[PDB]
A paper describes a structure:
The [name] family of transcriptional regulators plays a crucial role in controlling the carbohydrate metabolism and quorum sensing. A typical [name] protein comprises an N-terminal DNA-binding domain (DBD) of a helix–turn–helix (HTH) motif, along with a C-terminal Rossmann-like fold effector-binding domain (EBD). [name] repressors generally form tetramers as they bind to their operators located in promoter regions of regulated genes.
[name] acts as a repressor of the dra–nupC–pdp operon, which encodes catabolic enzymes for the utilization of deoxyribose and deoxyribonucleoside when other preferred carbon sources are lacking. Successful crystallization was achieved for a complex with an 18 bp long DNA duplex (referred to here as OL18) that contained the first two palindromic binding sites of the operator (5′-ATTGAACAAAATTTCAAT-3′), specifically the left-half operator sequence. The crystal structure was determined by molecular replacement and refined to a resolution of 3.7 Å. The asymmetric unit comprised two physiological protein dimers, each bound to one OL18 duplex. Each monomer within the dimer contains an N-terminal HTH-type domain and a C-terminal effector-binding domain of a three-layer (α/β/α) sandwich architecture containing a double Rossmann fold. The antiparallel β-sheet formed upon DBD dimerization results in swapped positions of the EBD domains with respect to the N-terminal DBDs. The dimeric interface is provided only by the N-terminal domains; interactions of the C-terminal domains within the dimer are negligible. Within the crystal, this interaction was observed between two symmetry-related [name] dimers originating from the neighboring asymmetric unit. The [name] dimer interacts with the major DNA groove and the DBDs within each dimer are spatially separated by about one DNA turn. A tetrameric assembly is formed through the interaction of EBDs with the dimer from the neighboring asymmetric unit in the crystal lattice, and this crystallographic tetramer allowed us to construct our biologically relevant model of [name] bound to the full operator.
Residue numbers in the entry:
A (entry chain B): 2 to 312
B (entry chain A): 1 to 312
Write the structure that this text describes.
DNA sequence: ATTGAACAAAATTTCAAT
DNA sequence: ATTGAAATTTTGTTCAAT
């Protein structure tokens, strides 16, 4: 009684799993084209072919709402990434970072920047704007040397150009050998306004770093091999090379007190402190940072965002 | 790459399908052109926004797989839909599934044996690159001096290697030696044996079954010297790795298969996953003899050939 | 219930413009 | 690149036709 059902199931499939024409189907079945159309209608009617309007948008909205409540943030943006490998996440996040900055930055904003290959990516997306009275400042200390390009210079430059301003560098190394040295530098007439502008910034954009032995800070030699072994133990991640713990506290003030850059606690004051991070290799650093309540805007992927809530 | 267009596009697709609205109609509510609406719908399908699934009695597909999954004692049986019953049409579709399966299957530190074949090469091309490490990929099948079609042997194993962040282990030997003694002491050469041994160590194996007709050039390259060509034609049903067998999956002539190069057949049964991709209306006899020989424990086959199998 | 020419409404897609 | 207009198939739909 049901050799028709089989045909309807057979023909309907060809027209959906082969991208076949109605007339393509009528050829092999040696039947009329109108008949084939009727068969397809019949299959839809009894539900041999069922159609679904999956919309991840809704999912992402709600997930964000949880992170907003969980860590008490102003904004949480969950960005869809098709892949959970680090690279794919980075790219998708980066491009959203760009868009957000473009939408967010208004005439007369004071914008603090950092460097990082993360940070560079967000910048690279064009994000140009006819904005006025905007200034852009370096928040993170620099290097003597590195095996990879830091892209530090170009990073802040591109930000500047895009905002019809020019860069305020912080022309200092990330770490001084001695704390007294560090104190006396930050007080210099010129240096101080740069740090002060750092603190004045109403926008701040940064990533959090990893603990892998492939970290730039580990490689470059401004840290004791002996102390790094101890420091790594107590430090989940870093923002601008100030290291925190699983509760967001400075793991070592001894070392932090000889580290250059705007101060972590300053971040809490800022009208928008924007963390972009993601990647399942980084989840440890993100929890610490949000616990420290250093960000009030979070940009994160759904892989990492899932791992943060469901834990 | 706009949040609004993704939202607007999906809403329109939702409207067109769910409430059964015409593109013209959708264009009314959205106050846009009819062509635009059509493009939006295409975009939604493209990014997988709208998903269409076809359901049926299990016989048609799925269980169609389980019945022989259990009949031949195979671990896995995958029946792939092909819109047509000719070889090319089937091969193409099987090939693409082959690629996907390998991508899902191959894990860090696998030993992967492959072969060559017009079949094998398409699976190879449709292979997806993968973030995997410690993987090794080895040649299981002997080679040729010459052929009228390109064997694609080299590129086949190369593409597999590249995709798995390893490099190729070739077997630099002819498929057949004139004399069995020659063959034996070649296999014992310290360099060669590492390769054959790695062949036996492989926990994954991927191969097709060449039919009697297919290896007519094996017949035609002066091997088997004909007095054996006859013996093989009538008896053998197929050939995996240019080794032959009969309908009950048994080496047809051990005399001949003792001067043949490649990873031994019986080794295939030992492997954690031995994956046969074959199908085709003209090629069922071979599959019959390969699955009976208990060589494969994973089968990838089309529905035309799969039904013809259950008709024994 | 059921074909299928012939017609008729419905998407596809090039063509031109912005 | 994008949007509509315009033409062309592509899907549906009346009609009993040869």
């Amino acid at each position: 009684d049901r050799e028709k059902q089989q045909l309807s199931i057979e023909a309907a499939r060809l027209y959906y799993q082969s991208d076949y024409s109605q007339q393509q189907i009528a050829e092999q079945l040696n039947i009329s084209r109108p008949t084939v159309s009727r068969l397809l209608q019949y299959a839809k009617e009894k539900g041999y072919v069922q159609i679904r309007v999956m919309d991840p948008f809704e999912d992402l909205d709600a997930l964000g709402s949880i992170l907003e409540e969980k860590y008490g943030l102003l904004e949480a943006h969950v960005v869809f990434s098709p892949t959970p490998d680090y690279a794919g996440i980075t790219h998708d996040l980066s491009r959203y970072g760009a868009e957000y900055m473009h939408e967010t930055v208004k005439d007369g904003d004071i914008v603090g920047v950092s460097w990082g290959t993360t940070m560079y990516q967000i910048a690279q997306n064009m994000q140009p704007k006819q904005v006025k009275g905007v200034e852009v400042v370096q928040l993170k200390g620099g290097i003597s040397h590195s095996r990879v390009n830091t892209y530090s210079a170009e990073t802040i430059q591109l930000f500047a150009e895009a905002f019809q301003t020019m860069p305020r560098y912080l022309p200092l190394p990330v770490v001084f050998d001695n704390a007294d040295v560090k104190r006396m530098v930050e007080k210099d007439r010129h240096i101080e306004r740069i740090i002060e502008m750092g603190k004045q910034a109403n926008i701040a954009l940064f990533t959090v770093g990893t603990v892998r032995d492939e970290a730039l800070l580990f490689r470059l030699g401004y840290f004791n091999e002996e102390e790094k072994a101890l420091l790594k133990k107590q430090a989940v991640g870093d923002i601008c090379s100030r290291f925190f713990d699983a509760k967001g506290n400075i793991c070592s003030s001894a070392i932090n007190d000889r580290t250059i850059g705007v101060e972590l606690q300053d971040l809490r004051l800022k009208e928008r402190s924007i963390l972009v991070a993601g990647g399942s290799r980084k989840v440890s650093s993100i929890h610490g940072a949000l616990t420290g309540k250093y960000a009030n805007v979070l940009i994160i992927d759904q892989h990492t965002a899932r791992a943060l809530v469901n834990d």
